[PDB]
């Protein structure tokens with residue numbers, strides 16, 4: 368049904384909206400929570416806090432979000448066998464609310480505990496929310512446009528990040544006080560997802576293979592498709608089902624010891640190890656700090672910051688015309704190299720900062736090129752690259768190895784960024800430059816074209832490089 372198209376859009380809204388929000392909520396109250404941290408550690412552990420460990424306390428406070436995602440990757444392979452798909456999607460609503468109330472209690476109490484452990488309960492909502500959804504929301508009415516749903520998931524991450532700056536302004540909600548409500552505003556998107564979940568009927572391919580409930584399924588497909596002809600669409604979903612139970616689900620550890628995936632387990636991880644160490648997550652995270660040191664005038668940082676996430680939204684909608692026309696190889700490999708030079712130009716601005724008054728205005732232009740290069744370049748392409756990278760026997764095991772490196776890497780970039788700032792001062796992005804160009808070199812010589820080609824030449828092209836032939 369056409370009316371369900373926006374309902375399904377809302378069904379994918381709160382899960383994607385919330386994950387992006389947590390990446391940008393750090394941005395506005397960054398000095399305010401640190402001052403509130405100062406009121407902590409003197410109340411019970413009475414002594415002034417050394418600045419060396421003060422940054423450590425904030426660094427673990429921000430990076431713990433990634434760790435909750437990592438256990439969110441591991442929780443699926445236990446809970447998924449007995450809990451249902453909507454039932455698992457029902458659970459994160461409870462985790463989101465429980466996480467929010469701990470955040471709302473942050474100023475009610477006088478401790479730092481609830482912020483750290485409470486954000487762990489936000490981290491698990493960065494898990495199953497972005498581990499259930501992306502390959503399991505794929506129940507839009509047309510089955511041929513599913514490539515759009517790849518980017519539809521990605522665009523709402525932009526708004527989730529974008530609303531963080533909007534709701535963190537010095538006029539709307541981000542003040543010296545009322546900062547718990549900046550965290551406490553996360554309730555209303557959660558309940559909206561909770562409100563739409565009963566409104567969303569069910570998962571049409573779940574009840575067919577698990578519950579054996581074809582009588583209710585045919586009514587479900589009429590709700591999604593909105594058409595009377597249903598027999599052809601219910602027979603095709605069983606067509607692949609017999610193939611699924613014919614094939615053997617290969618375990619996780621058998622990949623890391625198989626010689627035919629010697630340079631394929633290590634190349635899927637570095638395709639997305641260069642997704643979090645690409646640095647953009649650091650941009651979103653610590654944006655208030657980094658713009659301040661680049662010669663920017665004070666009292667306007669949030670006033671210019673909206674462009675950091677603004678073009679993220681604009682580039683995402685503009686990415687629809689790029690994927691089909693260019694493919695998946697040249698923009699992925701060309702995206703990293705395009706911004707490898709821009710880090711150098713960024714570092715030129717950050718080093719000088721004084722020769723002209725437009726140098727700080729040149730610094731911000733460098734940042735906007737990085738986001739424009741990213742969403743248009745490597746965006747959701749690594750998510751869908753890995754889908755066709757392996758075959759269907761190891762694909763459910765693909766995200767087991769891919770998810771774990773995703774969040775440990777996100778934990779790595781979040782934890783070590785502030786230490787690099789205080790140590791390397793203005794050359795802090797040189798390390799970020801080395802890793803990103805490394806992805807350009809590594810992926811150039813290994814990855815062939817993947818657009819519009821079936822697995823046969825994907826394997827045959829790789830078999831040459833691998834001398835695989837087991």
Ligand SMILES: O=c1[nH]c(=O)c2[nH]c(=O)[nH]c2[nH]1
Pocket residue numbers: 521522524525642643647648746747
């Ligand atoms: O569409 C996205 N934009 C980002 O900024 C981002 N950061 C991340 O880790 N995953 C994504 N996905």
